[PDB]
Symmetry: D2
Subunit: 286 residues, 4 copies
């Protein structure tokens, strides 16, 4: 059964958009030094965007910024920023505008998470997650938005959440709550700031080869109809699409990128997929 | 006519729905219980026999309300001063709750703050203030009560009051929409995670409840967007709350109930603006 | 105490009438599928509370036996009318008889349904169509006809549709049901909006499994409340929604599932079996 | 610059092909209602990008004129097959022909629909049933038949249903449509889960109003204009492409923000101007 999934759901890990389509465009990406943020930056730069990446670890940031800069031939700028601090965010936005200009693409990708029984969390642990995910995305959006309105310019905004932002989930509760907050913000500002030329969309990723929580991966895939984890390149292509001018009428959308995981686990009778064809013949007799 | 039809068939029943003394021996904890919706909920639960404990920042109003309800129902209402955004204040509040009344059977997360403002006019501190009261406050209260319930091998029904815009978003109330959305995801998360400890979690999403008013013309415009043709009442909301926090709803867990007179379905439906089309105009349209 | 004991102690079913004696005096209720299972349960409670109930379904014999049984129990007369809801002519006659024998309904419960549990590939076009007809078209026809008569008479009513938790999420193996049930949900939200000016409000209950081969025990493991629901509990919820206490509840969709949907839908809820001791080891890794 | 100027500048439609030239070569696409409007636009893009297209609907004349017109424009052959989707036999015969003239589909688009805008109380039972039959049962029959054939041939495909933003919310005045479309969404999510093992994936686009008087609805669209057929086609093509091979069970709004605008309780405050907001905070 995995031969059908491998042949018909095989990943296409190369650029989807036309060459140089992001030339003249400036992108700002929180968490752009690692994992998903890095892949989005990698693609946007390769397609001609001037990228600006921000997070806490300047060492990883600079290394990644230089690595992509030489790989694509387009300059990637690194700026140190803790998104939960409004003054640092203010500085980062100001520096973004000086070294690159007002952004056409804003990607809120920075996150933190604990996997834990909720009863083992301290108030500070809870607050930490809310600060990075919700308030951090809020501060970045508030400041850039304020500058864009000031400069009579618009932009595409993108927030990366999770499939559990919409459903909730035990064991990742502060994240689930913060991420749900991030989605509500996108929907709110898609409505409010459309008049300013700003649009807001969301990707809800399932487990991507970077999941979280050798035998565990095999178990995870059993809950994924597409029979595999996602890839950073595939996610980047989706992100680039939503941040591109081809999607200029996509606003307030929320797109699952999960190989079908959410629809599988959420469906009441989907546990019946374990039933074999011979067993079904017996049940259909009654 | 429309007005007389709505008034007759959507008439508010503002009396206790549940059987008298149905909450005897139960203890309820209500954040924001001193005013508005919290007060209405406290008043009903106390009237039905519950021992209530109400918590908020303003001790004077909280004490006044607690004494007012106590005298009306003959059941004690305890006031405790608490800023829910302060985890240490929350810890001491829950500690006092357990000593004065007992472990709660009912926990109502009702305290909130809001600004109506263009988002561009908000400071980071204004945004954070709302997130702090709504999301972190409800989290801190839930976390600490939950910890004490698990320790005590006891369960409880939890209720969070959100808004119809928690699920949809809304411009002009963005910090609130975000924080209230977080509150809903928390309820769904802990309905699942903590069912095994005897805790269940539900949500009511209220539309506008009768509680800038000036001419009264704004209310007239608000009602045009409500199918039921009126604002809701505190007593009706309280009945819904009491039901969800009652043993009759012991199998209701992770539910989200709109209490809005049909407002959300009206405004969200793409072609609902066609309600302003007359019978005559429809005749010509159906003839095209 | 263990999980089971906490669930038993703190989610115990209260299977007696919730609303005050005689609260439905002078109310007429129309309940499709009112002769068996959930429909019979709702009919029993409404009648006991004073309503004049009219039940309608295909099997006149089962319908008559139920109507007699409830009439003798409660003292209040329950009328039985033979109706296949997918037949619009039969629905017309049924509503005409309803108005003649009882009066214009104050409560309309669309409860009749059909369902197959089967791999979708095994379904014939007729098998699919059969489910759509009973569930979606049947609820539509009953709703259209009563609505037309209520508008004519300048009378209002509370409408209630019983769907399922999988109407919102979808689910394999019950696909025609999921589609038809989702349709029934959209209908309620649509008419909640459209027909408020006529004094008609529309709400929905989404039930999980309600108690009536070892799979019963298996379902419970996916229910945070640790048991199946009961008919009496569902009836209480139904009565509340169809009562004047809920006269401002309109367009609501209420899960009645012991937390099943939130449990199965949450990505990390598969970690629920990890014990106190095992969690210490996981936290040691992070 | 004013609202209309920013909206036009930063939400300008890009109506050219997004995906790489010939990216759909060796792929067969089956589109219901492919002879007109949105179906026509998706067929045109898929054919121009190299796909072998098959279109199916009731009106053979239009279904031949569009197919010939696309064939000559793109150079790639488009086949026309008469099919009323609400009839299982016509569907079965249509699936058999699709496999004969082109082969097993790699792309299935369920786009065919019918609608009335009417107060619900003026609808006959037949009028309701018509919409349910075309939209829900029609999509079901097409999906069931093609699905069955793909399982038998051990072949996979990407499925795409075009619904509406009101499928999720419901809406007065379009009730049979809202219901049937809601059902189509549920079907997609259901089969996304059920048929993963068969290599079949299912997604949904929910469009707002597309430019194919009624222009005051633009005041309810944050992006400040109606959408275009070419923009929708680009989104549709992406979802039906191998670039989207891990996208499954998704529902994408393509509405310029209309749904979030109308559904948000306080969004009716959008006309309040800069000057007016000062006194409110006092
Ligand atoms: C497939 C689905 C994927 C889903 C993923 C997502 O949705 S988003 C995932 C995004 N996040 C990540 O990938 C990783 C996230 N985070 C981490 O790896 C790291 O743990 C971290 C960056 C959050 C560390 O945070 P900080 O450096 O700010 O330090 P932190 O705030 O944790 O330390 C202070 C408090 O946290 C508590 N703390 C520390 N680690 C903890 C843990 N594992 N579980 C619980 N609590 C913890 C301490 O007890 C302390 O409490 P006291 O102050 O009371 O003494
Ligand atoms: C019908 C449906 C309704 C929906 C309702 C809901 O969802 S919730 C319903 C709640 N609705 C309400 O009417 C709430 C009203 N009031 C309250 O909840 C509370 O009294 C309160 C939030 C004002 C209390 O505030 P606190 O004392 O906790 O904190 P405080 O407001 O001082 O925080 C400081 C920041 O607030 C900002 N601030 C204060 N008023 C503001 C205003 N009207 N508009 C914008 N910003 C404001 C200041 O600029 C300051 O930022 P700087 O320090 O950077 O300068
Ligand atoms: C356990 C959990 C339950 C959960 C339930 C729910 O959520 S909702 C609950 C609703 N229903 C139920 O729980 C249970 C049962 N419901 C019913 O039995 C329904 O009333 C009913 C549809 C069977 C009754 O309608 P009919 O008598 O018209 O059905 P009938 O079988 O005559 O319809 C003719 C077509 O059905 C097909 N058919 C019958 N059984 C079938 C099956 N198990 N799998 C596939 N197809 C089947 C026949 O092949 C035939 O197609 P052809 O002519 O092409 O050969
Ligand atoms: C913004 C728009 C979004 C739209 C979304 C979509 O998905 S579709 C987009 C809009 N386009 C369309 O809807 C196109 C076509 N829609 C259709 O419903 C159909 O294809 C069609 C009616 C034109 C043709 O179907 P038929 O051959 O069955 O035509 P027929 O006239 O027999 O239709 C059957 C029933 O429709 C009823 N009917 C026709 N017009 C009606 C109207 N304006 N209001 C109420 N009812 C009407 C008739 O009375 C009849 O019921 P009786 O026999 O009882 O008298
Ligand atoms: N990978 C998956 O399978 C998966 C699944 C679902 C959702 N997601 C989402 O996708 C996004 C990226 O995931 P990922 O796995 O790639 O993340 P990651 O690489 O593991 O790390 C998170 C990123 O956020 C930055 N960050 C953390 N705290 C910050 C702070 N306070 N201020 C500024 N930046 C901060 C980090 O940089 P610094 O350490 O230098 O600060 C890092 O680049 C996240 O939003 C996540 O929720 C991922
Ligand atoms: N009324 C409506 O039409 C409506 C509509 C939608 C949603 N809601 C929701 O319903 C709930 C009640 O609304 P309401 O109108 O009754 O509110 P309210 O009376 O105007 O006041 C909110 C309550 O929360 C308390 N509170 C505020 N900040 C607090 C904090 N930091 N710590 C502890 N308590 C705090 C206040 O008491 P103190 O000042 O003493 O702290 C007050 O009792 C809220 O959750 C609201 O979001 C109401
Ligand atoms: N029981 C559960 O655990 C559960 C779970 C989720 C949802 N539900 C929902 O709850 C409702 C009641 O379910 P139930 O368990 O009570 O099922 P049930 O006992 O089998 O009752 C189904 C009823 O529908 C009637 N019916 C079937 N086809 C009809 C038609 N063509 N015209 C008129 N009536 C028809 C039947 O009466 P006739 O045979 O005489 O026609 C029967 O009374 C259904 O809507 C179901 O989808 C139940
Ligand atoms: N245009 C918009 O602004 C808009 C907005 C939201 C959603 N949509 C959705 O987009 C899709 C296409 O809409 P459109 O605007 O392109 O409408 P359209 O131009 O009128 O196309 C509808 C198509 O469906 C076909 N059709 C109707 N009944 C059929 C049947 N019984 N069997 C087979 N085919 C049938 C028609 O072909 P024949 O007449 O030859 O049978 C026609 O090509 C629809 O699903 C619609 O719901 C459109």
């Amino acid at each position: 059964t995995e031969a059908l999934q491998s042949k018909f759901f095989s990943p296409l890990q190369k650029a989807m958009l036309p060459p140089n389509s992001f030339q003249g465009k400036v992108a700002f990406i929180t968490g752009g030094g690692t994992g998903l943020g890095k892949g989005m930056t990698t693609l946007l730069s390769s397609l001609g965007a001037q990228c600006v990446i921000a997070s806490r670890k300047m060492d990883v940031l600079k290394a990644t910024a230089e690595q992509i800069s030489s790989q694509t031939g387009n300059k990637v700028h690194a700026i140190q920023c803790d998104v939960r601090d409004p003054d640092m965010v203010q500085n980062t936005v100001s520096e973004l505008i000086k070294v690159a200009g007002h952004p056409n693409i804003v990607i809120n990708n920075a996150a933190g998470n604990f996997i834990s029984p909720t009863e083992r969390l301290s108030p500070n642990a809870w607050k930490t997650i809310t600060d990075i995910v919700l308030n951090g995305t809020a501060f970045v959006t508030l400041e850039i938005g304020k500058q864009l309105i000031k400069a009579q310019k618009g932009a595409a905004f993108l927030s990366i959440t999770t499939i559990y932002a919409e459903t909730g989930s035990g064991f990742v509760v502060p994240s689930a709550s913060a991420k749900a907050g991030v989605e509500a913000m996108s929907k709110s500002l898609a409505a409010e700031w459309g008049k300013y030329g700003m649009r807001f969309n969301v990707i809800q990723p399932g487990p991507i080869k970077t999941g979280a929580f050798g035998t565990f991966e095999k178990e995870m895939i059993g809950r994924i109809p597409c029979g595999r984890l996602g890839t950073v390149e595939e996610l980047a292509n989706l992100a680039a699409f939503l941040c591109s001018d081809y999607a200029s009428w996509i606003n307030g959308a929320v797109i699952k990128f999960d190989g079908g995981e959410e629809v599988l686990i959420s469906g009441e009778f989907n546990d019946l997929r374990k039933v074999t064809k011979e067993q079904w013949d017996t049940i259909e007799e009654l």
